[PDB]
Amino acid sequence: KECSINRFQQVESRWGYSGTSDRIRFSVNKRIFVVGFGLYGSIHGPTDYQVNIQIIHTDSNTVLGQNDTGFSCDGSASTFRVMFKEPVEVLPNVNYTACATLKGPDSHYGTKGMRKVTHESPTTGAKTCFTFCYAAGNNNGTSVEDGQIPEVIFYTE
């Protein structure tokens, strides 16, 4: 029942980390539990990252979930799972801010990013539509069209 959605259609190189969080805002049209993100990994390997991930309620800038964690990686253009300590419940049509601060070597990054991207249950046809929006400032250059945080890993309700 663990799902994921990737908002990028293509993968390029390379993206650098110097201490600034990659951030993207999103809202969902249906209630979900986010359990983590998929993040792009290094250009060369083997190597790894420390990574701090967070989900913040946008309107108040209050943290709902946060985890200082890590992942290791091989140089592929694939995405790597980094998990929150517990599920964060995301309510319909509330704006949330996803943060990942990677500390590590240069990575791949996503291109041709999508504003809207829909997950559809193969069992019921129920649609879970994600809308992504630009997180202005303090985002390591990440946007709706390019950058980090390709994937949200979640369960539907």
Deposited resolution, Å = 2.2
- From 22, 13, 76, select the one nearest 51 (Cα to Cα): 22
* Domains annotated on the chain, with CATH: 1-157 (2.60.120.820)
Task: Burial-class residue 86 by CB neighbours within 10 Å (0-12, 13-18, 19+).
Answer: exposed
- From 25, 116, 106, select the one nearest 73 (Cα to Cα): 106
Backbone phi, then psi, for 29, in 5-degree steps? -90, 0
Q: Which residues pair with 109 in a beta bridge?
A: 12
Q: What is the DSSP string of 41-65?
A: -BSSSSEEEEEEEEEEETTTTEEEE
